[PDB]
Amino acid sequence: TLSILVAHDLQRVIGFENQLPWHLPNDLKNVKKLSTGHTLVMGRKTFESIGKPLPNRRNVVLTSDTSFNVEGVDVIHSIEDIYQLPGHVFIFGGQTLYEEMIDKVDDMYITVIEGKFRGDTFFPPYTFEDWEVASSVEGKLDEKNTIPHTFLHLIRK
Ligand SMILES: NC(=O)C1=CN([C@@H]2O[C@H](COP(=O)(O)OP(=O)(O)OC[C@H]3O[C@@H](n4cnc5c(N)ncnc54)[C@H](OP(=O)(O)O)[C@@H]3O)[C@@H](O)[C@H]2O)C=CC1
Ligand SMILES: CCc1nc(N)nc(N)c1C#CCc1cc(OC)ccc1OC
């Protein structure tokens, strides 16, 4: 399976200044559970802002950097190398990845952040007429999770 995993806001903001604009541990928990024991594919900037691979799953970084050789990370230099990755593969971002991959994925796991944030990076426009809602679960608003959010699993129609 080839999936997208993204958190985006009402205006499809995904990032600001190489960081996430909001702080939503529920969504981190959702990522962890969904991708633990599987593969995350991310662009180099996303990797460099995380700072280290996420534990208990294969971390794959896409970069044109021929000197890239990070401990605990696998590197690919071409989009086409994604299709050779075995198992359940999640396109983990950021913007360039989502743009290159939106038309190829089976499937998208989207956390809709029900707010409008200052952003400099975006999820591409998509229509609910190409995508069927397999599940829509309202996130629990919280002490520690203070923005309304909805977990979507969408499957290509
Ligand atoms: N809300 C969310 O779910 C997520 C948010 N983000 C956010 O997104 C932002 C980063 O997004 P963005 O700036 O687009 O960057 P990316 O993380 O997508 O990284 C861009 C880099 O990835 C590499 N790359 C992409 N495509 C190719 C290709 N076809 N061949 C070779 N290398 C390639 C290049 O690295 P190189 O220059 O080394 O060649 C490129 O410059 C940050 O703000 C981050 O916080 C990221 C993921 C999820
Ligand atoms: C955890 C944020 C997130 N949620 C969903 N649903 N999908 C995603 N692809 C992401 C992401 C991301 C990149 C990222 C994660 C992070 O937490 C460990 C810290 C920084 C990040 O990039 C700046």
Curated annotation (Swiss-Prot):
Oxidoreductase recorded as keyword: yes
Disulfide bonds: none
Domain DHFR positions: 1-156
Binding site for NADP(+): 6-7, 14-19, 43-46, 62-65, 92-97, 100, 121
Catalyzed reactions: (6S)-5,6,7,8-tetrahydrofolate + NADP(+) = 7,8-dihydrofolate + NADPH + H(+)
Note: There are two DhfR isozymes in S.aureus, this one is chromosomal and is sensitive to trimethoprim.
Family per similarity comment: Belongs to the dihydrofolate reductase family.
Function of the protein: Key enzyme in folate metabolism. Catalyzes an essential reaction for de novo glycine and purine synthesis, and for DNA precursor synthesis.
Protein name per UniProt: Dihydrofolate reductase
